[PDB]
Symmetry: C3
Subunit: 165 residues, 3 copies
C-alpha cells in the first residue's frame, strides 16, 4: 500500500484522496468511533474494524481503498484490549502488532490501490499522562511497521506532500 | 511569497531572515502582543539584532495596509508570525467570554476571512514577502479545549498559506527543507 | 559527526545503530538517569561498551580514538533534562541555565571536532506540538531546540527520521 502521515490538520486526508484520484470505485474505511466529511464524500464512494474482510485479494487494480485513520484504529483497539492504569502496555503492543500484521497481509495481497492514513504524534514534549505516553510510543512503533510494509510513504506538511519513500 | 514553517526553536526565524538577506529596505511585520515583561524582555533580543534599514511594525490586523501593491520588487517583507496573529485573532473574537463558551466554527470562519485578505495582499505585492509560521500538530491530542481547536485552526491556516505560497520551507534543527 | 533527530519512537535509534555498522569497537554513551533499560543493554552487542554519563563527554570523545571505531550518543534531550535539573523549577533562571547548557554543548562540539572516530548523536524533535502550559517544559522545549541547531550546524550529516524512514537533511 501507500502510507500517508502527518500532523493534525496537515492536509493528509486531502493528499490521500489526491492519491486516490477519480478511481473508479472507492472504499472508505473510517475507523473513528463516534463518542461534515460524510457529506463531502462523493456519492460513489462506499463507506465501511474487521478490515482484512475489506482488504481483499479479489479486488480490482483500478479499485481503491482509503482507511482513515491508523491512529484512531490504534486507540479503539487499546480500549477494546483493555482503566488504563492497570494496563499491561507491553502485551497490548504485541496484540496490536498482530492486528497490524493482519492489515499488512491483507494489503499485501490486495490488487486494489490501498492508501492508509496516519498521524505523527511525537514531535512534541513528553506527556505527563501515562496512557498518553504509552499511546504515543505504540503509535510510532505501528507507523514504523506500516512504513516498512509500505511501497510509498509520504509525509504531509502544511498540505505539502513529501515522498520519503 | 514564501512560506517558512518549523517547530519552536527550529531556526525558522533565522532561515527566513536568510531568505531575505541583503535587501535594501525591509519591513519586519511583528504580530506579537507583549503580555509580560518576559515576553517583552525577549522581544528585546529580537530588536537588538535588528538592522537600521529594517522598519518594524507592530501589527496583526489589516496587513493589506502594510503588504502593498506599489511595493518595489527589490524590497522585502518579513512577517513574524502567523501563529501569533492567529492567536491574536482568536482571543479578539472570543472577547470577554471564556474560551469554553467560544464558537470555534464561527471564529474559524472569521479567521479564514482575514487569511484570505492576507493572501490577496501577498499576491498583489511586488516585493519579496516571507511569512513565518509554526508546526504545532506533530504531537498528542490536546486535553484543553481551546488548544485542541487552536491546533486545528493553525493547521488549516497553514495549508492555505502553503497552498498559496510560491515557495514553502520546512526547517528542522535549523536546517531548511524546501518542500515546495 | 552525525546528528540523528526525530520524534519519540520514530526508529531513529535503529537508524543510528545502522550508521554505526560493523564498527569493531563501539562506545555507547547512555545519558539516561535510572528495566526498560535492562533490555536496551540486552540487545546491545558484545563489542560495544557502555558509558553512563551526561557530563564531560570530552572525557570519552577523545582525539586518540581510532577512526574505524565509533561512538553512539543517546540521547541529547535527556542530557539536556539532567543538565537543567543539575543547575523549584519555577524559581529557575532559565537564561542562565541555558548558557551553562551551551557550555556543555560547546565541549561536546569541540570534542567531536577532534575525535577521529565516528560520532553519532541521537536527539529528538520536541517543538512540533502546542505551547506548553508548564513553564519548565516551555523552557526545556526552548533550550532543546537551540541545542539542536548548534549540533546540526556542527554536524557533517543531519538526518531526520520519520516513521522509521530516514531523511538526510544535511
Ligand atoms: N466514523 C466515521 N469517521 C469518519 C467518516 N469519514 C471520516 N471520518 C472519521 O473522522 C476522522 C477525520 O475527521 C477520521 O479518523 C475518520 O475515521 C465516516 O463516515 N465515519
Ligand atoms: N511586538 C514585537 N514582537 C516582535 C518583535 N520582533 C520580534 N517579535 C516577535 O518575536 C517572535 C519570534 O520570537 P523570537 O524569534 O524570540 O524567539 C515573532 O513571533 C515576532 O512576532 C518586535 O519588534 N515587536
Ligand atoms: N542509563 C542508561 N540509559 C540507557 C542504557 N541503554 C540505553 N539507555 C537509554 O535508553 C534511552 C532510550 O530508551 P528506550 O528506548 O530504551 O526505553 C536512551 O536515551 C539511552 O540513554 C544504559 O545502559 N543505561
Ligand atoms: Mg484525515
Amino acid at each position: 500500500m501507500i502510507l500517508v502521515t502527518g500532523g493534525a490538520r496537515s492536509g493528509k486526508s486531502r493528499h490521500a484522496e489526491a492519491l486516490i484520484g477519480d478511481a473508479p470505485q472507492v472504499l472508505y474505511i473510517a475507523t473513528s468511533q463516534i463518542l461534515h466529511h460524510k457529506d463531502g464524500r462523493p456519492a460513489h464512494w462506499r463507506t465501511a474494524r474487521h478490515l482484512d474482510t475489506l482488504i481483499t485479494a479479489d479486488l480490482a487494480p483500478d479499485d481503491a481503498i482509503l482507511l482513515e485513520c491508523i491512529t484512531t484504529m490504534v486507540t479503539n483497539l487499546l480500549f477494546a484490549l483493555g482503566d488504563p492504569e492497570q494496563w499491561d502496555y507491553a502485551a497490548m503492543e504485541r496484540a496490536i502488532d498482530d492486528e497490524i500484521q493482519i492489515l499488512i497481509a491483507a494489503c499485501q495481497r490486495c490488487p486494489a490501490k490501498v492508501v492508509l492514513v496516519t498521524n505523527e504524534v511525537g514531535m512534541g514534549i513528553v506527556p505527563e499522562n501515562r496512557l498518553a505516553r504509552h499511546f504515543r510510543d505504540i503509535a510510532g512503533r505501528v507507523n514504523q511497521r506500516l512504513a516498512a510494509a509500505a511501497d510509498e510513504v509520504w509525509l504531509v506538511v502544511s498540505g505539502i506532500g513529501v515522498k520519503i519513500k
